[PDB]
Amino acid sequence: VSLWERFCAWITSTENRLYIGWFGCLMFPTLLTATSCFIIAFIAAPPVDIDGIREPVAGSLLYGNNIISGAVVPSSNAIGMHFYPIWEAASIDEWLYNGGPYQLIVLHFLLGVSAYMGREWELSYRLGMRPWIFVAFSAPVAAASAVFLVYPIGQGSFSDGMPLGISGTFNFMLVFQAEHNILMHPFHMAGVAGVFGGSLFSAMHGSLVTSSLIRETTENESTNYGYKFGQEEETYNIVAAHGYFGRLIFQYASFNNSRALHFFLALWPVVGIWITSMGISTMAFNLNGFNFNQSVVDSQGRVINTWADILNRANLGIEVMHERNAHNFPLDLA
Amino acid sequence: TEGTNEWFGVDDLRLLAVLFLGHWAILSLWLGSYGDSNEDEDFFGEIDYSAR
Amino acid sequence: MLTLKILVYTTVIFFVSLFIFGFLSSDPSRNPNRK
Amino acid sequence: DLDEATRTVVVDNAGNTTVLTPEQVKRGKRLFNATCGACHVGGITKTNPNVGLDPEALSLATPRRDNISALVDYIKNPTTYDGLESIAEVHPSIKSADIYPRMRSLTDEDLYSIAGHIMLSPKIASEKWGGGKIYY
Amino acid sequence: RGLFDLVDDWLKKDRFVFVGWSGLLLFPTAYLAAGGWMTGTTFVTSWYTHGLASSYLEGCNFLTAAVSTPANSVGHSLLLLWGPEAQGDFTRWCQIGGLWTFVALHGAFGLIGFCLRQFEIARLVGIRPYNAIAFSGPIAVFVSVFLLYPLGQASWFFAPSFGVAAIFRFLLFLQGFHNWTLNPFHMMGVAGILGGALLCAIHGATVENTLFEDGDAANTFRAFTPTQSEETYSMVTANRFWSQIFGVAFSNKRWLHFFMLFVPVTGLWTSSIGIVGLALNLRAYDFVSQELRAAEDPEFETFYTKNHLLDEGIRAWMAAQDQPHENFVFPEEVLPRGNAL
Amino acid sequence: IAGRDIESTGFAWWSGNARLINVSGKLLGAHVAHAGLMVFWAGAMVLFEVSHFVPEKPTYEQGFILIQHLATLGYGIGPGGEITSTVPYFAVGVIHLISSAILGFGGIYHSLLGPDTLEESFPFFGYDWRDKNKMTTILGIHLCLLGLGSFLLVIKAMYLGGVYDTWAPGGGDVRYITTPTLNPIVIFGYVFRSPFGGDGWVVSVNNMEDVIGGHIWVGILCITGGIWHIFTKPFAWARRAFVWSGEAYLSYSLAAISLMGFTAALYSWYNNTAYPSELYGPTGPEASQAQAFTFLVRDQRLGANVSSAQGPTGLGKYLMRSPSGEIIFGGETMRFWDLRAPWVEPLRGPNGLDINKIKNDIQPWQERRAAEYMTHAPLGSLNSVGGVATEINSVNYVSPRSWLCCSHFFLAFFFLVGHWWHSGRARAAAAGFEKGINRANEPVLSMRPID
Amino acid sequence: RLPEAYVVFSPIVDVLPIIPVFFLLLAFVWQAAIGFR
Ligand code: CLA
Ligand code: CLA
Numbered sequence A: 001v002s003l004w005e006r007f008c009a010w011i012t013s014t015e016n017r018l019y020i021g022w023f024g025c026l027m028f029p030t031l032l033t034a035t036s037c038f039i040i041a042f043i044a045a046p047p048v049d050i051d052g053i054r055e056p057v058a059g060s061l062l063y064g065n066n067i068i069s070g071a072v073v074p075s076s077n078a079i080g081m082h083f084y085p086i087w088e089a090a091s092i093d094e095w096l097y098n099g100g101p102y103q104l105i106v107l108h109f110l111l112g113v114s115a116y117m118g119r120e121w122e123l124s125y126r127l128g129m130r131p132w133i134f135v136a137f138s139a140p141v142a143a144a145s146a147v148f149l150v151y152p153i154g155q156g157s158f159s160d161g162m163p164l165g166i167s168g169t170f171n172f173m174l175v176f177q178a179e180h181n182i183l184m185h186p187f188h189m190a191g192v193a194g195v196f197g198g199s200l201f202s203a204m205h206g207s208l209v210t211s212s213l214i215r216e217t218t219e220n221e222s223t224n225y226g227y228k229f230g231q232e233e234e235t236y237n238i239v240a241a242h243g244y245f246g247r248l249i250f251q252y253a254s255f256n257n258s259r260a261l262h263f264f265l266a267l268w269p270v271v272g273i274w275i276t277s278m279g280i281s282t283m284a285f286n287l288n289g290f291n292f293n294q295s296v297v298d299s300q301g302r303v304i305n306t307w308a309d310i311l312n313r314a315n316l317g318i319e320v321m322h323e324r325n326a327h328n329f330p331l332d333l334a
Numbered sequence B: 001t002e003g004t005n006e007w008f009g010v011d012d013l014r015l016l017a018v019l020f021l022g023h024w025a026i027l028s029l030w031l032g033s034y035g036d037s038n039e040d041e042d043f044f045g046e047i048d049y050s051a052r
Numbered sequence C: 001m002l003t004l005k006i007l008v009y010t011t012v013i014f015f016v017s018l019f020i021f022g023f024l025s026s027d028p029s030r031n032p033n034r035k
Numbered sequence D: 001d002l003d004e005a006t007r008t009v010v011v012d013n014a015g016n017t018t019v020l021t022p023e024q025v026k027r028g029k030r031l032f033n034a035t036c037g038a039c040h041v042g043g044i045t046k047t048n049p050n051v052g053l054d055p056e057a058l059s060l061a062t063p064r065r066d067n068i069s070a071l072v073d074y075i076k077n078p079t080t081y082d083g084l085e086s087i088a089e090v091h092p093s094i095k096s097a098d099i100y101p102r103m104r105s106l107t108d109e110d111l112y113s114i115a116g117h118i119m120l121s122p123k124i125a126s127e128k129w130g131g132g133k134i135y136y
Numbered sequence E: 001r002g003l004f005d006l007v008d009d010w011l012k013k014d015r016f017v018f019v020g021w022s023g024l025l026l027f028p029t030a031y032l033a034a035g036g037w038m039t040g041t042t043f044v045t046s047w048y049t050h051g052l053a054s055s056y057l058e059g060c061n062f063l064t065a066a067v068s069t070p071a072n073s074v075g076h077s078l079l080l081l082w083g084p085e086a087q088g089d090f091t092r093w094c095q096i097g098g099l100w101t102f103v104a105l106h107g108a109f110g111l112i113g114f115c116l117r118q119f120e121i122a123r124l125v126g127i128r129p130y131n132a133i134a135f136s137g138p139i140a141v142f143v144s145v146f147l148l149y150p151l152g153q154a155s156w157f158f159a160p161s162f163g164v165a166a167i168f169r170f171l172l173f174l175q176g177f178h179n180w181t182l183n184p185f186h187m188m189g190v191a192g193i194l195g196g197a198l199l200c201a202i203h204g205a206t207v208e209n210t211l212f213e214d215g216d217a218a219n220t221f222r223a224f225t226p227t228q229s230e231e232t233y234s235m236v237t238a239n240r241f242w243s244q245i246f247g248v249a250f251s252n253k254r255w256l257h258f259f260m261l262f263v264p265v266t267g268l269w270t271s272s273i274g275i276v277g278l279a280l281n282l283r284a285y286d287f288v289s290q291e292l293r294a295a296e297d298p299e300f301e302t303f304y305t306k307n308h309l310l311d312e313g314i315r316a317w318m319a320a321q322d323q324p325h326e327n328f329v330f331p332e333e334v335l336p337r338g339n340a341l
Numbered sequence F: 001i002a003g004r005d006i007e008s009t010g011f012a013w014w015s016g017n018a019r020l021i022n023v024s025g026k027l028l029g030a031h032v033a034h035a036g037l038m039v040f041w042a043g044a045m046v047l048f049e050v051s052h053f054v055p056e057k058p059t060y061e062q063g064f065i066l067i068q069h070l071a072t073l074g075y076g077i078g079p080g081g082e083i084t085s086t087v088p089y090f091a092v093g094v095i096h097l098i099s100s101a102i103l104g105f106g107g108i109y110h111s112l113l114g115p116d117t118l119e120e121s122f123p124f125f126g127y128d129w130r131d132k133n134k135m136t137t138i139l140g141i142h143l144c145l146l147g148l149g150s151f152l153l154v155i156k157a158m159y160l161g162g163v164y165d166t167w168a169p170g171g172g173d174v175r176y177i178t179t180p181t182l183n184p185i186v187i188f189g190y191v192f193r194s195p196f197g198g199d200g201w202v203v204s205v206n207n208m209e210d211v212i213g214g215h216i217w218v219g220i221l222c223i224t225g226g227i228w229h230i231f232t233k234p235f236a237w238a239r240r241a242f243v244w245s246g247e248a249y250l251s252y253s254l255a256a257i258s259l260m261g262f263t264a265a266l267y268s269w270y271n272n273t274a275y276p277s278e279l280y281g282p283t284g285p286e287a288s289q290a291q292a293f294t295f296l297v298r299d300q301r302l303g304a305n306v307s308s309a310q311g312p313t314g315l316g317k318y319l320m321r322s323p324s325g326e327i328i329f330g331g332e333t334m335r336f337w338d339l340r341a342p343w344v345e346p347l348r349g350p351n352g353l354d355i356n357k358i359k360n361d362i363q364p365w366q367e368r369r370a371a372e373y374m375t376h377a378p379l380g381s382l383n384s385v386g387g388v389a390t391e392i393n394s395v396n397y398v399s400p401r402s403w404l405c406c407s408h409f410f411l412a413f414f415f416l417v418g419h420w421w422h423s424g425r426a427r428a429a430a431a432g433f434e435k436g437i438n439r440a441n442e443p444v445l446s447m448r449p450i451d
Numbered sequence G: 001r002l003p004e005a006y007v008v009f010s011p012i013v014d015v016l017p018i019i020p021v022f023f024l025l026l027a028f029v030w031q032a033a034i035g036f037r
């Protein structure tokens, strides 16, 4: 009867086209502002002093870029970790010079993605679902907050944060290799196993369902039209695909349970990306990966090279060349 | 002035009257239904289905 | 620049207050089980 | 393959050469990394990269520093590179060992093995010792 | 009846491990690729080929051990044990790097023999052969990297060695010298690998969260007998969920599980096309409109020109120790350093 | 066996301690046994940290994390961060070891011989999760203890010995907190700051008067709010917003313990007041400034004017100006211009680094400190070799800050996942559909057309 | 190291922090011996 109850009834209605919910009250204003500023800053945005040395790096399309090289540049080294909104900038020209829109996009992104995650919970509550799709979405939220939030914190500047682009991503990955040795760190190892394993069990499960489909169509029409939507009959012989994989490797390595099978597809990647995103986090605070340089010696004591020493000389090439003007002192403490 | 240690970033006095009239303008909406109810009615559930 | 700043704290604590007083609005009872 | 010709290092300013027993080269590495190696790792100096532990750089000091007797001289009394004034107040030493807690327990044979490690390491690794990151 | 029928009936007999006709190609060749790797990473060194240490005898752990590629002087020889290089000696065969071609060749006939295994079991069980066609994805990555990439290059030396950190340098060797991340075929491959990991994390978490009540226990894993005809999760609910969260959603289980096949496999085929184009050094190295402008205007900087200076560090610093056969003796004064690093 | 198989409960062996939700004696014995393990570790770790103590190396080079908390309390510490005694550290690790054998016996008694439910025999200790008067009493009793435990810091810092102030005039030493700060505009000044750079929400407490003065207000709140929740009952709005069940209270804690998990992991990276650099090693920001100060001293001895020394980029090579106007150090160290450290604050002014004081008054203990904090920067590896990621294997050092900021930070994300799991289940266990969708009554079928 | 009346037990103390890991493994050993029921 009241105005608030007629507003709570609408905002929590599943009869809307898109469910809004109470998290959409701060998902939609956040992500539309992260979007509408990203499209403008990617297309039309002046160059940005990223190294704090007043050498402005172009990143937008109107200043001679493309899809690959164009990128929303991170904020300045001069700012660093300080909060830099528009009203604390004394003009928009001073805001866009010093890496303004990187903080406006990222902070409205991480609020909107952490609200998109809670929104996946909310609709599962109002639909009668068991709730935990949003726990599986915690794994890219862990990884998005690792390269945009946690790594600028432990390194003390948003300038070490990830550039919102495509070539800026590979500037981020290579400089992160030289300074932290991520490939030898066992948490990037535990998530390469998460996505190689994840793409394995995806294409391994998706093939054994498509292999054992039941005849419901003719050879002229499509294979997919043998599934009517909302039917109650099972659309594939699960005993058939169990007997196949029960002979392809051996018998006891096969899940006859389809529920425990469809749980292992959700376990393996998500655990692999939780562990990986806490690799960037523990390497944000300079707890680097393994270092086996000069580890094998002869009885005389001369250093015998290994593959890690060849990997070290690739890291030394990126270390002596990243931010080639920003350094003045012999050790990259930042 | 960015790195000042001021509460909620309230630099000027005018920003307070923005905050108080934001929480209260929806609080007064909320009290139009969930306010003025019996504050002495209990349940032995995990969850209450009392009224609107 | 102190006119924009006023506009943001309106918009933030408008939607934050809809969030805060959304879950205070007997939100566990809004399920498909009963009521 | 630690031959005694390779363990034979120069010991005095005149140029006599004596050999290091195999416990000297082993304690010489453990003590150097624990005491000196925080800044003098691999022969370079972190806090002053001009003055290294190179056998070229030890020889060009105004007292010649290549000898074992010259290095243990430096530890008990560190002068500068031109040897005019003392920097015992800032370099860890025996004379100024009340400030540095790391050097309150060192014997004569312990400095004899640390200086043994500084001298015998350019003979093992010819270019890695104090060559910087180019020769890692 | 005949002699062929007795052999055909014996191989296809139900037993512990299904042998079949294809097991005569798989089980000898896969056993020797795997055992050739465990031996080569334990005992055989890389001291004469690369000038490294890549064994457990030489102090390397699991990470820094490898079965390494042979010398550049060998060229593309197959390095047969009886060949003109090894000449029957086992010990000189291992020091030249003969185990690496032993692993790669008997491994390539393991992936032939394992994909034939998936056609044979599908014909006996009587199903469609999409496992054997999705496994053709990983065949196109082994062939076009461990085989077709060193063939276009100077020798077998520029191939990935079969060891954990030896793959890791091959990742770094391919950025500095080839600019591999800029190649659109890797970009369509990352979209399939991160896209394939995405689909199993969603389909894992949506089936498990729209389950029906089939029991009174709190454990839902117990409430599934395998031979039941009732579906175990509400497809109508899961469609209604994602149609409001994400906006668009699958309404077809046959199209869904096919789409979980197409996305991971295509990322292995599109990325396999590009690595064949790097055997020929047809790399996507530069945007010339970016390069002509940065030469004429010494103020124009992008992130893209920042990656070239990172590649000069990879091309100069590691190439001295990368290729000891070529004898790069760089002075200290040609190596590109930055300011004060 | 009844109550300890899936036929009676419905929980498998792997989710086996979920059988303890609706028994109270077995659940009490479980919480006092895990409390017996928290104690037992801390006693046995400090004895492990005493038996490997060497007076030669500093306190942070030896890789300890627990005997540096007691040195902040002031036991066995001397002036300048020099640990003297290490007989009182032995004494603390025995009391936290003997006592776990008593808390161990409560965990083995109450969970193997105690009654399954306390509500039958012991009406004071027995409870129900759905009850709301008892649960605020359990919250109230265990809040007055957290009030009293906060005053033990205050009693110890004002009366019993004192605490280690690294800002203490004359050098870092055990200092009695005479006059703590009791201003709520200052103490709650911290709690309502920005969490970003320069403000640094609650990490940025920069003297021991605000620390010890702050733990007073915590003891005031936790006792008045402890008495508040004993007497009262949850209000009308608080009964409508929560789920009053067993697992829901567990997912309330896991959200809040993750807040404390990140914050203790960010104290250890930035704060050099509660965590003195003499004990925990230099911070991330502090070792970046100690490098630029060392080469400032180095090239000042070569007769170089360091103020007018034009850098290679055109900025200051040594001294430049911050974006708020202050004289700072230049390089990549310009990001850490908020670094307030007891060896650089002698060189401050109103404006910043006083150029007259740099040209004339640099004391050799600052040179011995900046050279110590350059070589022991918090940059390590998992095999515990120091330096940069491309450093050779000779040193054995990873800073104890980097172990605390990478492990309590590591856990504090997984306990945020524990807030997501255990509250998704508890909100759905209250509503009835945690076991799945009913086949007879599906809620989606009784809705509108889909669009 | 430990005080002089306690230098004898320096091997036993080195094992002691490991012992809380052994309680995590003690649960699974107990679940194996009960037959996971
Ligand atoms: C923090 C660790 C911890 C603790 C304290 C508990 C505690 C408990 N669990 Mg449990 N559990 C744990 C971890 C833990 N669990 C883990 C990790 C798993 C997964 C494998 C399980 C799986 C599990 C299942 C499946 C079940 C329990 C059950 C129980 C309860 C009763 C056990 C019982 O009566 O059987 C008798 C127990 C034994 C015979 C074990 C004897 C081992 C002794 C006590 C070891 C003592 C060693 C110690 C050093 C001695 C100190 C003595 C002192 C004087 C110094 C008890 C409260 C049961 C339950 O729910 O009860 C209703 C049950 O069904 N647990
Ligand atoms: C939080 C922990 C906790 C809780 C709630 C309980 C609760 C209970 N225990 Mg139990 N117990 C515990 C820990 C705990 N115990 C520990 C650690 C041990 C090992 C020593 C035991 C050993 C034990 C035995 C052997 C028995 C009980 C019994 C009981 C029941 C009746 C107790 C009674 O007579 O009350 C009134 C008791 C008192 C007023 C005496 C209190 C004296 C203590 C020393 C005061 C505590 C001082 C202070 C608050 C603690 C400060 C240290 C702190 C910072 C850690 C009751 C349910 C009895 C039972 O269930 O009957 C079958 C029983 O026989 N307990």
Ligand code: CLA
Binding pocket: F136, F139, F143, F221, F222, F223, F224, F225, F226, F228, F229, F232, F233, F234, F235, F238
């Ligand atoms: C371990 C810590 C702890 C825990 C878990 C709880 C748990 C609880 N407290 Mg409690 N409390 C504690 C410590 C704790 N208390 C302490 C130390 C104090 C003393 C300051 C209080 C004072 C207190 C009060 C006064 C009330 C509760 C209430 C509650 C219930 C939940 C409400 C809530 O979280 O809203 C979280 C809400 C916020 C963080 C913001 C609320 C903003 C308020 C409502 C604006 C109105 C102004 C109001 C007069 C306060 C002025 C301060 C400022 C906001 C203007 C719950 C039983 C409520 C209840 O049901 O009472 C029984 C209640 O009214 N607590």
Ligand SMILES: CCCCCCCCCCCCCCCC(=O)OC[C@H](COP(=O)(O)OC[C@@H](O)CO)OC(=O)CCCCCCCCCCCCCCC
Binding pocket: A018, A031, A224, E245, E246, E247, E248, E249, E250, E251, E252, E255
């Ligand atoms: C604020 C949040 C609100 C939600 C935001 C909305 C954004 C949603 C994006 C719409 C996807 C549209 C693609 C049409 C696709 C289409 O319409 O498919 C429709 C298809 C429905 O299939 P049915 O089961 O109806 O098909 C049965 C048979 O008829 C098969 O033909 O749905 C899906 O399979 C889509 C699932 C994968 C979704 C693919 C999305 C890929 C992400 C987008 C990549 C492009 C981004 C480029 C940016 C430069």
Ligand SMILES: CC1=C(/C=C/C(C)=C/C=C/C(C)=C/C=C/C=C(C)/C=C/C=C(C)/C=C/C2=C(C)CCCC2(C)C)C(C)(C)CCC1
Binding pocket: E031, E032, E034, E035, E036, E038, E039
């Ligand atoms: C080369 C060659 C040869 C040979 C072959 C063969 C016969 C081989 C085999 C071999 C083999 C076949 C090997 C094997 C090996 C194995 C190993 C050595 C293993 C190990 C293991 C491990 C170490 C693992 C670990 C673990 C465990 C135990 C448990 C837990 C988990 C883990 C994983 C950790 C010939 C004569 C033809 C001649 C030519 C050449």
Ligand SMILES: CC1=C(/C=C/C(C)=C/C=C/C(C)=C/C=C/C=C(C)/C=C/C=C(C)/C=C/C2=C(C)CCCC2(C)C)C(C)(C)CCC1
Binding pocket: F033, F034, F036, F037, F040, F047, F094, F097, F098, F100, F101, F103, F104, F105, F107, F108, F111, G006, G009, G012, G013, G023, G026, G027, G030
């Ligand atoms: C219930 C249960 C459980 C649990 C258990 C527990 C958790 C327990 C705890 C336990 C405990 C927690 C224990 C503790 C103990 C301790 C002790 C027993 C101690 C003693 C001490 C001593 C003996 C010492 C000595 C010494 C001295 C005096 C001096 C110096 C030297 C030394 C250190 C040697 C489980 C899981 C199985 C499961 C089932 C059920």
Ligand SMILES: CC1=C(/C=C/C(C)=C/C=C/C(C)=C/C=C/C=C(C)/C=C/C=C(C)/C=C/C2=C(C)CCCC2(C)C)C(C)(C)CCC1
Binding pocket: C019, C020, C021, C023, C024, F187, F188, F190, F191, F202, F205, F210, F211, F212, F213, F214, F215, F217, F218, F241
């Ligand atoms: C010791 C010390 C101190 C002090 C401290 C303080 C004084 C504290 C405070 C604290 C506080 C004062 C805190 C607060 C917190 C709060 C929170 C964190 C809240 C939360 C809330 C919630 C969680 C809510 C939720 C919700 C919503 C939103 C809606 C509806 C439903 C519910 C209700 C659930 C200082 C700083 C001086 C310094 C250092 C030392």
Ligand code: OEX
Binding pocket: A077, A155, A157, A159, A160, A175, A179, A322, A323, A326, A332, A333, A334, F332
């Ligand atoms: O900003 Mn971006 O990258 Ca991280 O390391 Mn230091 O800071 Mn700068 O150099 Mn390297």
Ligand SMILES: [Fe+2]
Binding pocket: A205, A209, A262, E203, E257
């Ligand atoms: Fe599936």
